[PDB]
Amino acid sequence: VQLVESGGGVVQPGTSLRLSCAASGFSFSHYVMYWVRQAPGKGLDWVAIISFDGSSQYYADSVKGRFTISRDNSKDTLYLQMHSLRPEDTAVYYCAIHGGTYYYDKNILAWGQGTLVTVS
Amino acid sequence: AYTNSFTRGVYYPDKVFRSSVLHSTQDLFLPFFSNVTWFHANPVLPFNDGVYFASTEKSNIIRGWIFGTTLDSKTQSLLIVNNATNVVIKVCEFQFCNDPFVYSSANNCTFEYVSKNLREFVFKNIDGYFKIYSKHTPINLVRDLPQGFSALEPLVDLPIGINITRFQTLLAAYYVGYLQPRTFLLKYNENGTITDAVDCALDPLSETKCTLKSFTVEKGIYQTSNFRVQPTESIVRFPNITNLCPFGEVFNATRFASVYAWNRKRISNCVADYSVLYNSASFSTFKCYGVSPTKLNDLCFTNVYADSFVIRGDEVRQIAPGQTGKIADYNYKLPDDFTGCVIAWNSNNLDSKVGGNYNYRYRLFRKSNLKPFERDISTEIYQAGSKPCNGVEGFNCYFPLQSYGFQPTNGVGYQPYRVVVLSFELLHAPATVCGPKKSTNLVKNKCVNFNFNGLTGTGVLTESNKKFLPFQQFGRDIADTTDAVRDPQTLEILDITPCSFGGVSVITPGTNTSNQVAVLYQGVNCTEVP
Amino acid sequence: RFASVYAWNRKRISNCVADYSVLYNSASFSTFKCYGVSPTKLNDLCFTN
Amino acid sequence: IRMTQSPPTLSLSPGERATLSCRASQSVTNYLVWYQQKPGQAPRLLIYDTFNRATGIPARFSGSGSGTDFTLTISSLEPEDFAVYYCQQRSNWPPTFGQGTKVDI
Amino acid sequence: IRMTQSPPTLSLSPGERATLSCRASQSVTNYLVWYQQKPGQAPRLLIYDTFNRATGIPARFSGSGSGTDFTLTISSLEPEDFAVYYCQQRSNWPPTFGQGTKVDI
Ligand SMILES: *[C@@H]1O[C@H](CO)[C@@H](O[C@@H]2O[C@H](CO)[C@@H](O)[C@H](O)[C@H]2NC(C)=O)[C@H](O)[C@H]1NC(C)=O
Ligand SMILES: *[C@@H]1O[C@H](CO)[C@@H](O[C@@H]2O[C@H](CO)[C@@H](O)[C@H](O)[C@H]2NC(C)=O)[C@H](O)[C@H]1NC(C)=O
Ligand SMILES: *[C@@H]1O[C@H](CO)[C@@H](O)[C@H](O)[C@H]1NC(C)=O
Ligand SMILES: *[C@@H]1O[C@H](CO)[C@@H](O)[C@H](O)[C@H]1NC(C)=O
Ligand SMILES: *[C@@H]1O[C@H](CO)[C@@H](O)[C@H](O)[C@H]1NC(C)=O
Ligand SMILES: *[C@@H]1O[C@H](CO)[C@@H](O)[C@H](O)[C@H]1NC(C)=O
Ligand SMILES: *[C@@H]1O[C@H](CO)[C@@H](O)[C@H](O)[C@H]1NC(C)=O
Ligand SMILES: *[C@@H]1O[C@H](CO)[C@@H](O)[C@H](O)[C@H]1NC(C)=O
Ligand SMILES: *[C@@H]1O[C@H](CO)[C@@H](O)[C@H](O)[C@H]1NC(C)=O
Numbered sequence: 055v056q057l058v059e060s061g062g063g064v065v066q067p068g069t070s071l072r073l074s075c076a077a078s079g080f081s082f083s084h085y086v087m088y089w090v091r092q093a094p095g096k097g098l099d100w101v102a103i104i105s106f107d108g109s110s111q112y113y114a115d116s117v118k119g120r121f122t123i124s125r126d127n128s129k130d131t132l133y134l135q136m137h138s139l140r141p142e143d144t145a146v147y148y149c150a151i152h153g154g155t156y157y158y159d160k161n162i163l164a165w166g167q168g169t170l171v172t173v174s
Numbered sequence: 175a176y177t178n179s180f181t182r183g184v185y186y187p188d189k190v191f192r193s194s195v196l197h198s199t200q201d202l203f204l205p206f207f208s209n210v211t212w213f214h215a216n217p218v219l220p221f222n223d224g225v226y227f228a229s230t231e232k233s234n235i236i237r238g239w240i241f242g243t244t245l246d247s248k249t250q251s252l253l254i255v256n257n258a259t260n261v262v263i264k265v266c267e268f269q270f271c272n273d274p275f276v277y278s279s280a281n282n283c284t285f286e287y288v289s290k291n292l293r294e295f296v297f298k299n300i301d302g303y304f305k306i307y308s309k310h311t312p313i314n315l316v317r318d319l320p321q322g323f324s325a326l327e328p329l330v331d332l333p334i335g336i337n338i339t340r341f342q343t344l345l346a347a348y349y350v351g352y353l354q355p356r357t358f359l360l361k362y363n364e365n366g367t368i369t370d371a372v373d374c375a376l377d378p379l380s381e382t383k384c385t386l387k388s389f390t391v392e393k394g395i396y397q398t399s400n401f402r403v404q405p406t407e408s409i410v411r412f413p414n415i416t417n418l419c420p421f422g423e424v425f426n427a428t429r430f431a432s433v434y435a436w437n438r439k440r441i442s443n444c445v446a447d448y449s450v451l452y453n454s455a456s457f458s459t460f461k462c463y464g465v466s467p468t469k470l471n472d473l474c475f476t477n478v479y480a481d482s483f484v485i486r487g488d489e490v491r492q493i494a495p496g497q498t499g500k501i502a503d504y505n506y507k508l509p510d511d512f513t514g515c516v517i518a519w520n521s522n523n524l525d526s527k528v529g530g531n532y533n534y535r536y537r538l539f540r541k542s543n544l545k546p547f548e549r550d551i552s553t554e555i556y557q558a559g560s561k562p563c564n565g566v567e568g569f570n571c572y573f574p575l576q577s578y579g580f581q582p583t584n585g586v587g588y589q590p591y592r593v594v595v596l597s598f599e600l601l602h603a604p605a606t607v608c609g610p611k612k613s614t615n616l617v618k619n620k621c622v623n624f625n626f627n628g629l630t631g632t633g634v635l636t637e638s639n640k641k642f643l644p645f646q647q648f649g650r651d652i653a654d655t656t657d658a659v660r661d662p663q664t665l666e667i668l669d670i671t672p673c674s675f676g677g678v679s680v681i682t683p684g685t686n687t688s689n690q691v692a693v694l695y696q697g698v699n700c701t702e703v704p
Numbered sequence: 705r706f707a708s709v710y711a712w713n714r715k716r717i718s719n720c721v722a723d724y725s726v727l728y729n730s731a732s733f734s735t736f737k738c739y740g741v742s743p744t745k746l747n748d749l750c751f752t753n
Numbered sequence: 754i755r756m757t758q759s760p761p762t763l764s765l766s767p768g769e770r771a772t773l774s775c776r777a778s779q780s781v782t783n784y785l786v787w788y789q790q791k792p793g794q795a796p797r798l799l800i801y802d803t804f805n806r807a808t809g810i811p812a813r814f815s816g817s818g819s820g821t822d823f824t825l826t827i828s829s830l831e832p833e834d835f836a837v838y839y840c841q842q843r844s845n846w847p848p849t850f851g852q853g854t855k856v857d858i
Numbered sequence: 859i860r861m862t863q864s865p866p867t868l869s870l871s872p873g874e875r876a877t878l879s880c881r882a883s884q885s886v887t888n889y890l891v892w893y894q895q896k897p898g899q900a901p902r903l904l905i906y907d908t909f910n911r912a913t914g915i916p917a918r919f920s921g922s923g924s925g926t927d928f929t930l931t932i933s934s935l936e937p938e939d940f941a942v943y944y945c946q947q948r949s950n951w952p953p954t955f956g957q958g959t960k961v962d963i
Contacts, residue, residue: 088847088848090850097837097839097850097851097852097853098788098796098839098850098853099850100847100848100849100850103846103847112846112847114847148795152843152846152847152848153843163786163798163801163843165795165796165798166795167795168795
């Protein structure tokens with residue numbers, strides 16, 4: 055399995071940024087993915103979830119309404135679409151896999167390697 | 175080293191006298207010209223069926239044997255000893271030195287007794303009696319096995335009961351033969367002693383002497399035995415497999431059903447695999463009740479039924495024969511004599527939706543329990559008590575089928591589980607679903623043991639040229655013996671010739687001329703003799 | 705001493721002259737029950753084991 | 754449903770054994786996974802589902818515990834395996850990571 | 859010679875089948891009789907002598923068993939047949955009735 059994330063940099067408090075997560079190896083459909091942030095000097099905490107097609111997206115606190123996660127298995131990637139941001143969620147971001155949809159899905163887990171976003 | 179006996183290890187099979195009577199016997203003997211171990215001077219040997227045992231010296235280095243199964247405590251053994259005084263038979267539980275030449279324990283004794291040269295012994299153990307024959311001949315050598323004939327006379331008889339599997343020796347040159355069931359021809363003197371013998375399974379001359387019951391055969395030709403080719407293995411042809419029997423409409427469906435109206439599907443002519451379903455290692459509950467999960471891959475059935483639905487997590491235990499609760503009292507009752515397997519797995523990633531997925535209802539109220547393996551879709555009102563409501567609401571009336579709420583943000587035990595229940599039955603259907611089987615291809619031109627979908631037989635199979643009318647299963651021969659078959663799979667006719675068999679005759683110029691012999695295998699093709 | 709019943713002892717008989725009337729007439733026995741034979745014929749029938 | 758790791762920083766030498774405890778607010782069964790995050794790396798996962806560790810993790814890492822109390826044990830790691838550790842659940846949505854426990858000397 | 863009925867109260871719905879066991883202190887053969895006593899009625903007899911029921915008792919009532927262990931079976935009674943049951947012997951003097959087994963839902 056492999057996961058490659060992109061869309062980091064420096065922004066202003068009130069812009070947008072394409073947070074994209076590309077997957078290969080394992081089949082990207084039949085599999086539940088999500089994101090997780092970490093502010094540098096803290097622990098770990100999650101962002102948003104998507105359920106193998108867009109029918110059900112759950113959100114976390116204080117990110118509901120600025121964050122529209124979407125997947126599309128006809129081009130096998132994942133998006134957060136950070137939009138109209140704050141100057142306090144400068145962090146690192148990881149796309150990870152929750153796992154499993156059917157009985158034959160052999161649940162394995164994997165993580166990315168981080169995408170850094172900073173504000174002004 | 176190993177050495178060759180010549181004619182050694184003959185004992186009087188019993189009491190009784192006899193004068194000049196070529197007495198034929200069947201017993202345990204040491205075959206003539208055998209392969210006898212050689213020992214110098216010792217280790218633990220086997221017993222397995224009697225023992226011949228010779229020894230040579232002028233001093234006395236061989237000082238008895240020790241017998242038994244373990245040669246220690248925890249089981250009983252015999253001990254036969256001789257110091258410079260005299261013999262000491264003994265039967266206790268011992269503790270034997272692994273290299274003994276004294277012991278170290280004498281517990282629970284159940285039998286006691288106290289009181290160059292060639293010294294032969296035959297030891298045997300039948301029906302709790304331990305028999306010992308012996309003979310003491312004087313050699314004119316010191317320590318090599320000589321040649322000659324000398325019959326061994328019975329010495330002892332011990333009603334012990336002891337089991338024996340091993341034995342040893344005791345020291346202060348010896349051989350060890352073993353005994354097999356043979357047939358001999360003993361020549362008795364006029365005083366009643368055995369002076370000569372014939373082993374009747376050595377060569378053709380000896381088999382002739384045994385057939386005639388004599389020691390001198392006159393010229394002629396004698397039928398002595400039979401040959402019969404031997405068959406190996408045993409094919410088991412069978413008509414084209416059949417199917418693969420998919421259950422993708424059981425497990426791999428697009429949606430299961432609700433538990434108040436559980437779906438069902440029977441199985442017909444199939445080849446149903448069961449090991450490949452079990453080893454996927456993702457199943458919450460795989461519980462087989464009347465059968466073990468390892469025997470399916472081999473037992474035919476007569477009908478298989480699959481039920482399938484969705485229930486919550488804290489009621490998967492309710493799908494078991496003899497539970498209680500809203501899923502087993504009146505939604506899905508299992509009978510007590512069940513024999514199938516309950517399979518269930520968590521499905522929180524298909525049948526779950528944020529905001530809820532309310533397709534999956536269940537009865538929560540019923541007049542009473544619903545026997546096994548029926549259902550009810552009688553969606554009506556529910557009535558509470560002594561009031562007549564009968565289809566109103568509000569004042570304790572109801573609709574007794576409540577939906578489930580399945581969101582992923584709900585703890586386990588309150589999550590959707592997909593349940594598949596398998597049930598079997600076996601009464602008298604002669605050809606129904608069986609698991610992945612395997613026999614072996616067919617062979618030709620070899621005496622074989624065959625089974626053609628029921629026809630069991632033996633013989634050589636050969637390509638035929640008899641036009642079996644499209645509807646004739648096999649070939650019938652006058653006097654009614656099967657002589658042709660049709661292969662179910664490829665549908666070709668094959669003749670079934672019989673496996674060779676025939677008499678064996680021995681041609682001899684007479685023992686007063688020569689001991690050479692020729693052998694006739696009667697009407698046997700000379701390429702299949704051995 | 706006798707043995708316990710889980711491991712009962714046993715003993716066979718070989719060439720002998722076995723008396724049986726003198727065992728019976730001691731008149732101290734709780735149970736003397738002969739099943740396949742009468743207690744008066746032993747003193748005369750040979751056996752094999 | 755919130756995780757917690759109650760033992761704080763420890764000072765176990767390169768040797769000896771370490772035992773780390775993770776609770777849960779309600780009943781979670783065979784659904785935890787352990788992560789070992791160095792200073793400034795990606796959090797590498799350790800243990801599938803309370804009992805079997807993944808590939809590339811040695812035998813001295815062991816994971817056990819049940820009910821609502823779970824435990825990771827280092828038998829005799831080595832002279833480097835000092836980082837922060839996290840316990841995560843995959844029971845429902847979403848996977849909470851808890852607090853974390855450092856180790857020092 | 860004392861009877862006993864060891865299964866206690868049961869909660870079998872109007873459907874399903876029920877199986878009730880009666881022992882004996884010694885050997886009794888084909889000598890038992892079954893009684894079904896409602897709340898506050900006369901105990902109505904069921905089965906002659908371990909095998910044949912009397913008149914006015916349907917076929918779903920069956921009685922079997924032998925040796926010292928006897929059994930009454932309800933195949934699929936109805937929505938009322940819930941009472942106490944008794945097993946009695948007529949071997950010698952006098953007829954002991956045992957303990958009794960209720961059924962509920
Ligand atoms: C039974 O099945 C076998 C295959 O399992 C059939 O063999 C085929 O025979 C045809 C001849 O018409 C060949 O062209 C195919 O290549 C064969 N298949 C294989 C896999 O070898 C056989 O014909 C079947 N029996 C009958 C009576 O049709
Ligand atoms: C359900 O569907 C899956 C996928 O369609 C089946 O799994 C496949 O089984 C075949 C035959 O054994 C294999 O060649 C494939 O590699 C399997 N794929 C996967 C992803 O496992 C599964 O057997 C089906 N189960 C049932 C009961 O129909
Ligand atoms: C006895 O059998 C052994 C087994 O290998 C063999 O080596 C030896 O030659 C045999 N001796 C005789 C005399 O046939
Ligand atoms: C010979 O050995 C037996 C074995 O117990 C022993 O009883 C006997 O006393 C020995 N002979 C002498 C003279 O001690
Ligand atoms: C055999 O000996 C052992 C140990 O001395 C003893 O426990 C056992 O009881 C003995 N056997 C009998 C039948 O008494
Ligand atoms: C001898 O060993 C066998 C082992 O197969 C056992 O079955 C048998 O009972 C033993 N002999 C006696 C007399 O118990
Ligand atoms: C024994 O046999 C020999 C020769 O067969 C005979 O001469 C003798 O009389 C027999 N009887 C004896 C030696 O007592
Ligand atoms: C048989 O043997 C005797 C003596 O050994 C001999 O005189 C005779 O010629 C033999 N008979 C034949 C047919 O060889
Ligand atoms: C024995 O079999 C071979 C092989 O088929 C054959 O050539 C030969 O003719 C057969 N023997 C006779 C007597 O026909």
